[PDB]
Amino acid sequence: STMIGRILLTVVVIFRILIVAIVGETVYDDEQTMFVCNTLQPGCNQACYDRAFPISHIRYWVFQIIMVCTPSLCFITYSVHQSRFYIIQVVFRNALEIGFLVGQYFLYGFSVPGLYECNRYPCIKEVECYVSRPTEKTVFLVFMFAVSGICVVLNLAELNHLG
Amino acid sequence: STMIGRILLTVVVIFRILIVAIVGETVYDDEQTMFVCNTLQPGCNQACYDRAFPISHIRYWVFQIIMVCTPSLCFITYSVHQSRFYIIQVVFRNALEIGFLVGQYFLYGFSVPGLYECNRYPCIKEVECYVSRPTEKTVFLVFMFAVSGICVVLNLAELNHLG
Amino acid sequence: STMIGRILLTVVVIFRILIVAIVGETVYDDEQTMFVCNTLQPGCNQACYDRAFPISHIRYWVFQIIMVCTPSLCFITYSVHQSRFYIIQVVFRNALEIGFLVGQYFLYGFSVPGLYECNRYPCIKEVECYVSRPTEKTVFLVFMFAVSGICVVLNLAELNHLG
Amino acid sequence: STMIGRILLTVVVIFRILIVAIVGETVYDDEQTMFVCNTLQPGCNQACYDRAFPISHIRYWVFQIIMVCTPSLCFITYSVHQSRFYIIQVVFRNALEIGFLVGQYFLYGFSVPGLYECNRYPCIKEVECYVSRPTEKTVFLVFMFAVSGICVVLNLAELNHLG
Amino acid sequence: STMIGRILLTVVVIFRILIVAIVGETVYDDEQTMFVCNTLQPGCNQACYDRAFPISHIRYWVFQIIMVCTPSLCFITYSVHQSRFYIIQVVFRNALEIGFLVGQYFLYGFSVPGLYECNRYPCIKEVECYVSRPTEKTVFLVFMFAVSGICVVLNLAELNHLG
Amino acid sequence: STMIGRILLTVVVIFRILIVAIVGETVYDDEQTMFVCNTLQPGCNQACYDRAFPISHIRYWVFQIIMVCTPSLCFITYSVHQSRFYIIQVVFRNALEIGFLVGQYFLYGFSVPGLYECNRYPCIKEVECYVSRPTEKTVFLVFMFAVSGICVVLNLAELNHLG
Amino acid sequence: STMIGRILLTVVVIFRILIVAIVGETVYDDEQTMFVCNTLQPGCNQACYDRAFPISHIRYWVFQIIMVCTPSLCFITYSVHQSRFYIIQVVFRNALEIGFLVGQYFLYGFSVPGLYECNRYPCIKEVECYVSRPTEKTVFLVFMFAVSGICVVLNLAELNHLG
Amino acid sequence: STMIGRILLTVVVIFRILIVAIVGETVYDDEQTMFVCNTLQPGCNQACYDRAFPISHIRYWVFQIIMVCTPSLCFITYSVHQSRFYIIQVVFRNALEIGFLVGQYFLYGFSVPGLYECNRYPCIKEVECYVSRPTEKTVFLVFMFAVSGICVVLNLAELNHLG
Amino acid sequence: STMIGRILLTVVVIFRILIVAIVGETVYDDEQTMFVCNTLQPGCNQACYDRAFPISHIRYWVFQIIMVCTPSLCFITYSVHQSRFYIIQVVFRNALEIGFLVGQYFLYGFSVPGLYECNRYPCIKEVECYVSRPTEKTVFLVFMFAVSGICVVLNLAELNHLG
Amino acid sequence: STMIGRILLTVVVIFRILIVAIVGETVYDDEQTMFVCNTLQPGCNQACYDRAFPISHIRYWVFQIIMVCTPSLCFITYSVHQSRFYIIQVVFRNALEIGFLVGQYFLYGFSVPGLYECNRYPCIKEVECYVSRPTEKTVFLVFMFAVSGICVVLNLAELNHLG
Amino acid sequence: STMIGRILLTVVVIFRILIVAIVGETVYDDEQTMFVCNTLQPGCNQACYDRAFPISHIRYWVFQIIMVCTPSLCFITYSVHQSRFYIIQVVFRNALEIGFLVGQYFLYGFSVPGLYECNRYPCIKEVECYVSRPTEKTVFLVFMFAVSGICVVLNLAELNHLG
Amino acid sequence: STMIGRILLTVVVIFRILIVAIVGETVYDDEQTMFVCNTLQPGCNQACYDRAFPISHIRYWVFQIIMVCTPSLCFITYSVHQSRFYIIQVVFRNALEIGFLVGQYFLYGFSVPGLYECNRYPCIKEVECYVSRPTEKTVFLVFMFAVSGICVVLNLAELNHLG
């Protein structure tokens, strides 16, 4: 019952990592080339794009994948050079993944709107801008949040048993 | 008679997976760059493209390839760490592939039209938009539906024998 | 005399497969970007391109390469799991390659014209469109038809001996 | 206490090297295509871009990654051909990394502004130009400066013990 | 004296093959995008480009590299399945390489002009068109002709000795 | 003292080769797309670009890397088939690298100007053109000249000892 | 009381005629140059302009001015060549002016909208078009209808007295 | 009865002449600027405009006004220098006006279509072109034909009496 | 003292009328061609121009010139057909000119701003538009208001004496 | 018989002069704005227009009208200040009009072609240009040549009688 | 001596008035269409044109012509209705013309520069703008100032004699 | 002999004045709109046009017509208010016309070139610009110089007789 969950964690991790490496890289290719605003101003496309999407979805997910696999790198490299390390590494993984999930919800939310209203310099008054591919990016948002939730839950399976 | 079908399933799976990795990625390269609508409105190209093609054909097929190979990943990883697992994994594969096939038919259908009629904001009244490469995408649709059907049938070969 | 022909078949197959993987992919890169029609109509470039070239040359050749190597995949995978299989696989290869060659001649012919005359909707009356790179695509057509003919002939060498 | 720090240095190094190889290459793809100035002058976009960003962020970081791993290449190649080499290589690594960090702060600083004011020939009087993606490049700047600081500190851990 | 020449042939062959795989592919990237003619006619750029450069330089060199290495593939595959084969393969290599060299001189010549004069349909009367990068393509032409000559000469070294 | 210099030569060679393979390829990507001249003439951009930069910086450096490693290829291939070869190969390497360095200085010099003055046909009288990225290309020029000098010096270390 | 009304009719007539000759000609100058529709279709601007404004306001008013002064031309030319003519000419003037007023109301109405919805060939489905200067043309419409009403009333003053 | 008709002829003549001098000149101002064809060909707008409208409506009407008033100029100038002249001048006026009316019907007809189909050189195959203001030009056509008919009839009133 | 004021009224009237006929017509020529708004919307230039300037300055002044000279036309035409008429005509002129002056102040005010903020359909949110020639139109506004005031005052000179 | 011809000369002269003043001025309005050539060259439109039409049709006809009425101006001004003058003036008129007619035929001919082939600097090789309104200008050419012929003939009527 | 000066004043006045009515109106036709600034900003052309030329040269000269002829209109209209009026009118003319001349020098100066430097909103920092036809406008400025000076002097001739 | 020359002077004067008022005004209409230079610089068209044609041909001829008729205005106005005036006026006319003719030759010369070479700021180095209509302007130049010469000669006829 409790033993197999490790199989589930490993498989969702590698799954999680190749959806994000083979699918996500090309939904987000033309983000800024196909982002258009309704103005004649130079430099308002750049301002309003950077205000709407300060850090892209896929950069945050790459960093979140790499950062929650660093504790394992420590646990491997300690073994090669040679259980108190084990529990520490597990609690640190749990803390990192919860912090990253809640930071995700607070950065992005649950949706990607199709319109944005922008009032940064050099734009005059407020302007309207149009996102390219909002429904696919919404589906990807919700899929990553669900997988993140599943691994949060399964990591919390192991915590209670030994702790 | 019944024994060889496994050879056929494995070969159609790897076949299925490399047509989709070497051919499909570049029919769908210029989908949004070569999608044109008949208007002067900013932001109606984005709205009407995202309404016509909410999730691209090839993202659904990547996910369908990866998702129907996850049960095997569980069956391998259980064997390394060490028959009731076997039958469960087979029935889950069958259920997943049937659900994905019927979801495909209900998302996309059997054709890709050359014209689309769109009435989303910011577009004014209804507008006409023009798909790039509708015949090749139709041939690919029908080919994937046929291969999906073949593996559905051959998976259902094995179910009856043991079950 | 008869024995060496297998060497010739294998070498023309791998030859055939790397000309098509290293040369063909970039003659056909800019096909639709550099296809131009003589009109002011939106959406007539897409219609007339898709009417002229319903399935690209190189997609048909990829599929023809992959499809005429699937019988060997069956013959290998049967041997790993463990002569009546042999002759069946050979006659199926022959039938597949002849069907694909004649289907090629009936799809494409022997030439690629430099002009095309098109009368699809949304185009008004008939229009004239201009193919990019017709001579190189003609040379590639004729080269693939000749190599296909050579392997058809050499496969038919083996049929008569055992059959 | 002191022994494990080597694990931390190695892991931050490989970490540091793959964030920079998988993330950084595509924030900086469209830097000059999406850099716009407010003029009708030919050649003022080139002048003002090259004045604002004389050496890109990511070229400096590639060179800094490669240059602070060359002492290890010397220490490996000496061992294959066959402790005084060791301490020398460590002090040289420390000196190189401190020099590169302070040179970074003096080249770039801590921010990337969204506007630039430029008065190079051929531009007339002073002109205003607009950076694409200033917030993401700022986050990357600060992240690289923090990781550089961490490895500076941990290298200085080892110096005091033997020295 | 005579023995070492084989070392020279092998090294010039691999040399010849990686200059052509790492350098040549990107001189010829923008050939048709940066080819411009002096007209307002649709479809005269395509006609005049295809008349000037019917088969690109680098496609001919790829085919010439692959075609003059096929005899060795026959000589290897015969050895695995198991001197009269040897001499035949050598004379065939010599004949192939001389035929390809002289065909090169008769297709392309020794120069790439910077201007071209074109009178194909749909162009009106004769028109003037402008080649992009003629000096680099000339240097590459002459370099490939010189290396081809060197291997022609060294192959003819071996012929006389045994023959 | 004299023995270790070989370590330094090997490491600067591989260093030299990966700065040039990972950094240089993308400074020189948009050279001709972002090269602009001040005219309305068709075909003066092509003429003046090819007059300013007859052979790109990075093609010369690729060829210089490959050409000064061919003597080692001869020395390896002789050893496999089996000291007079050794000294010959060293003097040939020295001669090749000095010839390539001085040819570099005579082709390019020490700078890349930001303006160019051009009077080739089809341009009318003399025209002014604007280089993209002159400071980064200058830094790369000077870096390659310095590394070339270092290996020239260290090769000349070995010459005197045996000679 | 009744006698002076003729003074009022003559003065409103000449008034009516010079507002229409000095003011009206240049409100209606740029009508078709500044009429814009929201499409990319050739020839939909012409179709939709001609459907919206089949006969311009000012052509109808010129014809109405000229046509209701022709009876006086008959009455003058009869007198030069030399009371039954008089009453006939008056009743004909009355009939003409009432017919022209009611025809005006039935052609144009009381307003000029700022938007028009158009579904003529070559336009696709229905389209939206934008009138230039709708408020000034509305003020002119209402002013001409009021003056027309005043002269209708004053002509009907004279009818009853003699009739 | 018969005497007054001369009053009617004179008044319709001056009427006819000022509708044509004050109204007609500006319906036909932008005829060729606002005539558009559906092509990218240079010089097909000129060819197809000149094929559709070989002689403008208003040039024919100016000439018809001037030509049917020349007999009166002869009759006046004869009287100043000083009945057989009279009847001759009347029959010549009648013949001229009938010839001009029937020539009008045979040149232009009764309508102005909104579309024209054109196959003149330099146009490719047949093309579609769009007339500006077809309804107003139709109303003017029919009005001039009706007035021409009225004066034809009234001239034929006088012929029978004396003749 | 009181007698000469009539000379002043007549001369300011003809003065007033030729400044407005020779100067004003061409300040207001390019009003709508040189009116620009900051948007990509079709039809927002028309909407926002017509909202900013519903009736042009010069149409109101033409009508005000013509309307305050109609009482004199009545007083002349009464005299030709033949003091109670006199005083009535004077009080009506006074009332008309005061009503027109105060209506002017309430329509236009005392300034013409260089910017306008507009939120009419089809414009999105509020937009900014730019008036051409605001200082010259301001000088003309103030000049016409001053001359109007002077004639108001001098007309009120005559009222008190007889009344 | 001979006496009336003077009436015919005077009337054809004034006729000739008002067709040319009321019709001709606006066929030739847009001659150079609507003259298009098939090139991208600056300044080839100007060169080829000025080569095709060195002196416009209507300037030659204005000068021919004014120059053949100057002898009458001499004959009038001599009479005011106060038969040998008479005959001289008539023979000079005849000589002037014949010289102008034959000069017309030698300048222009009898047609206006729709295409022109031009090889002036700055044009490259020969180019094709397209005349606007060639049929109307042909009709005007032939009409002026016929009227010129008629007055030539009638002037030659008077010569023989007195001479 | 003193008597003839009146002839000179009248002739310079009518001279002055027809140079300004026949020449000046078309130097100043394209002033704002051919005024260009070096920016991409909407609305900076309007701002900077109106800042450079607040009131056109020719409007000031029209007003100066009309205003210095109003005293004569008073002197005529007084004579019709019927020497103290005379001297008053002369001193008022003198005062008006001197005030207008010095106001001219203080508005415009003696030159029209070819460049203007502008820093009004919406322009960013300071911008450079280019005047069309500065030398002709300078010649006209100096000519009007000289003629104004001549009439100032000759008016001052008459003042001293009677005064 | 000597008496009639006055007839010739008067007629050439009025002739001279109406060729220049009816023909010249529209050769010089599009001078600056159809003047094109070969650059991308803003403001180089204005600079180079104003350098090439500082004062237009037709402004100089208007001023020369008006200035050589002012002495007659003096001679008329002296006669109305009432032989020493006569001779003075004649010598002044002669001096004015000779000065204007030689000033013409020194301003303009005898030709109008089709190309101009310009090196004014803001133009970069020297540029080439293209005159519109050089042959017609040359014919007009030579015609005005010939007529000017004729009146110079005939004025000099009268000088000698009385003087």
Residue numbers in the entry:
A (entry chain L), B (entry chain G), C (entry chain H), D (entry chain K), E (entry chain I), F (entry chain J), ...: 19 to 100, 196 to 276
Q: What text does the study give?
A:
To investigate the possibility that the pore-obstructing densities correspond to flexible NTHs and CLs, we performed a structural study on two Cx36 mutants: Cx36Nano-ΔN8, in which 7 N-terminal residues (residues 2–8) are deleted, and Cx36Nano-BRIL-ΔN16, in which 15 N-terminal residues (residues 2–16) are deleted and the CL is replaced with BRIL. The cryo-EM maps of mutant Cx36 GJCs reconstructed with and without symmetry imposition showed similar pore-occluding densities, indicating that the channel pore is obstructed in the absence of NTHs and/or CLs, likely by lipids. However, in Cx36-WT GJC, flexible protein domains such as NTH, CL, or CT may partly contribute to the cytoplasmic layer of the pore-occluding densities.
